[PDB]
């Protein structure tokens, strides 16, 4: 989550209906747009932000939220316009001996701004004396491990979260929803619409 991945999507048709009916989603919250209306909208760019958190931390991924994940690992704007999808990955990201590869930022001087990524591993200075790259009293490593296990509770179980953000600028749009098309009618007075030409 502290090094959450971001991918830019553009110049393609986004099929929202099939994307939303693929897997069983434990969490699906869209803000500023209904899930169905995206099939009708065009946007300049799309951003796919993927990471893994705890179940109890999933609530942190929403506009106007606070917490360790919200403040130090991944921050959303209060006016976020986009969707959030989250699903348990206990059968994927949990190990018998503990899956410690997933990490999260614990100590940070200031909270993250929206869509700001912090990958610093510098020893956090929790006291007046400097740490100088040395961890100890009042000097702690800023990142902490999750250690997911299959026998943990769903709150402690890993959850994969993807945030879809829709950037709409004053530039020619690149991503739109699926175009419908009805059957053809001949030799009859009809209200036709060919490729947007009505």
């Amino acid at each position: 989550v502290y090094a959450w991945n971001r991918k830019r999507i553009s110049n393609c048709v986004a099929d929202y209906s099939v994307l939303y009916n693929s897997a069983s989603f434990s969490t699906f919250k869209c803000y500023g747009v209904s899930p169905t209306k995206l099939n009708d909208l065009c946007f300049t760019n799309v951003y796919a932000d993927s990471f893994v958190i705890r179940g109890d931390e999933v609530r942190q991924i929403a506009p106007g939220q606070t917490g360790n994940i919200a403040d130090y690992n991944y921050k959303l704007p209060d006016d976020f316009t986009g969707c959030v999808i989250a699903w348990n990955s206990n059968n994927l990201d949990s190990k018998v001996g503990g899956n410690y590869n997933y990490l999260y930022r614990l100590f940070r001087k200031s909270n993250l701004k929206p869509f700001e990524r912090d990958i610093s591993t510098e020893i956090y200075q929790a006291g007046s004396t400097p740490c100088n790259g040395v961890k100890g009293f009042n000097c702690y490593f800023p990142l902490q491990s999750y250690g997911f296990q299959p026998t943990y509770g769903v709150g402690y179980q890993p959850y994969r979260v993807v945030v879809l953000s829709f950037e709409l600028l004053h530039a020619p749009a690149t991503v739109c929803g699926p175009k419908k098309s009805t059957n053809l009618v001949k030799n009859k007075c009809v209200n036709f619409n060919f490729n947007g030409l009505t």
Partner: antibody
Amino acid sequence: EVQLVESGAEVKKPGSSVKVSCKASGGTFSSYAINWVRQAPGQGLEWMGGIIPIFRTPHYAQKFQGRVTITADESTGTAYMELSSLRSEDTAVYYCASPSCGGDCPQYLKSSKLDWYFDLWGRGTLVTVSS
Amino acid sequence: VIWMTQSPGTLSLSPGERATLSCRASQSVSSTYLAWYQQKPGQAPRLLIYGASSRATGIPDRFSGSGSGTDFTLTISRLEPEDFAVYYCQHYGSSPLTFGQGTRLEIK
């Protein structure tokens, strides 16, 4: 109001274990510096260890290493101290104590945290170890 | 480990007299990391002084702390009957946190 409340008194046999609790109330429990201090009858004060729950990294005094386990439950606002392989010399009053921030008060950068009181020592739980 | 040694072990004085208690660290410590406590029989310790000389809230003006490096003192300028107790110094600047063995203040 900020207060510490220990569990009731315990009577144990040598070689067994004791687990005492300290409930903290007031403020944010996750950043609460909980320390354990014991006092044997007629003896001085001995610091055993402590924890700040958010870091999940307990500290122990070398005398108690491998016998003491300190944990915290953030959902109940409760710290626990477990002492194993008990001896008659472990007969003592066990206090919880958190002077403002334990060992992380002096922080004048990230935030304010310039609070320092003098009323954060639990009254104590008597553990008696006898055959 | 830093050890703290108090002196005297017992001090016998009358109300109205001045008490002075000493605490010696086994090595030089920052004065920021030295405290003094009072303990009455059957009561938890009460903080009197922190940072070698800063008085805790609601502690009377008769209590003062001083010293630096290895050598620290607690002074009670005029003893009151409620001051007869055990006093402990503490070093809190690194693990393990250490207390002195105590000084018992008794009525003469």
